[PDB]
Each structure stands twice: as C-alpha cells, then as structure tokens.
Symmetry: C3
Subunit: 114 residues, 3 copies
C-alpha cells in the first residue's frame, strides 16, 4: 500500500519517527506486511481547507484490497488520530481519499502485482 500526506504544516513540525509510525500503524491496520508499505509526507504546502489556512492535510491511501466502508472508517480514525497528535492538525481539516487498486494496475519490481 501507499500512504501520502500533503500538509501546510512546516517541515520542522514533523516529529522524528513520523514516517516509521505511519509505516508500522498502516501495516497493522491493513494487515499487509510492512515491507510493502510506502509512506510519503509533504510539508510546507500552499493549501487551504474551507478557505482558511490553519493546519490541514490532504491524504490518500492506495491498497490492493483492504479498502471498504468499515475499514475506511477505521483507517480514518487511526490516521486523523496520528495527524492530530503528531502534526496538531484538527481531524475536521483532513481529507483522505481511499483507493482499492486492482493488482494489474499496481506496478512494482519490473512487473505488476497481477
């Protein structure tokens, strides 16, 4: 799976250990081996949420399966919780787009997962 967070919070406000915490917590939440979890954090962005520029985040989670109504609710609680605790972003200023990828549409290691 792949998790991306884009945020206006400055780089200096991203704590040590943040990528590792995302990797570990997403491995647990998705049930996928951590060796297959990729994470990407993009601070210092020019962004607004509802026309205001308090801390906010726009995120995506792509996974081959492990995406659905109840699962996505659980991921949103986990991820908003981490962004609130670690980046001080209010959960009502976070969007996370979830993508259930077909295996044939995910390239890796000179091929796809199909």
């Amino acid at each position: 799976p792949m998790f991306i967070v884009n945020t206006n919070v400055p780089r200096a406000s991203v704590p040590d250990g943040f990528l590792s915490e995302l990797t570990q917590q997403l491995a647990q939440a998705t049930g996928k081996p951590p060796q297959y979890i990729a994470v990407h954090v993009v601070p210092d962005q020019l962004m607004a949420f509802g026309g205001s520029s308090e801390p906010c985040a726009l995120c995506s989670l792509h996974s081959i399966g492990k995406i659905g109504g109840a699962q996505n609710r659980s991921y949103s609680k986990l991820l908003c919780g981490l962004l609130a605790e670690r980046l001080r972003i209010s959960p009502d200023r976070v969007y996370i787009n979830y993508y259930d990828m077909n295996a044939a549409n995910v390239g890796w290691n000179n091929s796809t997962f199909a």
Copy 2:
C-alpha cells in the same frame, strides 16, 4: 471536494488570494459549501508538457458527485480560465483529472462521508 494544481510557474507568480478565489469559484461551480472545498497549489515543479517546459499544469478535482460529462466541460472552462488569467498558463498546456468519489472512500473528521 479537493482541487490540486501542480505547475512549473514560480511561487512568486501565484497571486495573493488565489487559494481563496479557487475556493469560492469551486464552491459556486460544484454547488458544495465552501467549508468543504480544499485547494492545494504546488508551484516550482519540474515538469514538461509535450517536451516543453513552458508554463503548464497538471491538476485534479475530486468530488463526491457533481462530476460528469457536461459538468466536467464546464469545470475545465472555469479552471483553465483561472489558470490562464492568474498564472499565465495556456489552456492547451493544462490537464485536469476528474474523480467522482464514493462517499465511503473519502475520509474526514475521524470517519468517512458514508
């Protein structure tokens, strides 16, 4: 909804108030309240369109509904118009990807919109 623009134009060329203008224009075009519109502008990118690094943009609009054939034509006129007037990018060097999101696949505020 979420609107993202990635462009090679320099940050100094993005006018003050551009994020607010995008927020309000997207609220009007989509019929969604501005409180739910997020906008993200990424200048200074390393990008080419047709092999040329003249000003260009790669954009996305994600929305729960309000996406379709006629609506997307109207959004493209609006958004290319704004990128041309405000960032001096030719409409023929802009791509906009439109995504009609299922409510269950959009996380927000510790849950999803489902």
Copy 3:
C-alpha cells in the same frame, strides 16, 4: 499519458535530459503523440518504502485507454528500468499506480477529451 514520479533522490541526482527521455520513451511505449505527453518529477521527498529511506519512488501513469494487464507490465519494465539506470532506484522500491481514465474525466484546453 501523463507520468508523475515522486522520489527521495535529490534534485542534483536527476540527470540532465530525464524529462525528455521519459516523454520520448512513453511516446514509444504507448504510440501516443509526444506533443501531448506530460511528465512531472518530484525529487527531495520525505518518503520511506518498507520502513527504509533508501532511494525509492512512488509514481502514477494516467492514460485514456492503453491501460491493461500486459500493457502495464510492459510500462513497469520500461519505467523501472529508467528509474534504475538514471536515478539508481532499485525496481523493488518503486510503485507505479496505473489509471485508465474515461475521456469525459480528463480536462484539457477549456473542455474535455469526450
């Protein structure tokens, strides 16, 4: 197509001519006119793959058609090959998400491709 690569490799390690090579090789692999191919490279990113911040890349390829099981395998060999040769990223640390876009969902030049 349009192709985006996000990587932790530093900007100074992206060789001259890389965007051109991507544009031309994508033209060859898809048969699409190069004048409409868009490429975007984002170096210096804060990212991990399997918990490690050795060189890695997270990419997307969007196309209207020209996406499928065999085609995507061929694109992954081409693109991983380029990322390994030019950016020194191991193919097993690359993900590429493939998107088959409906023409009505791609805006360009004040309209859509529908």
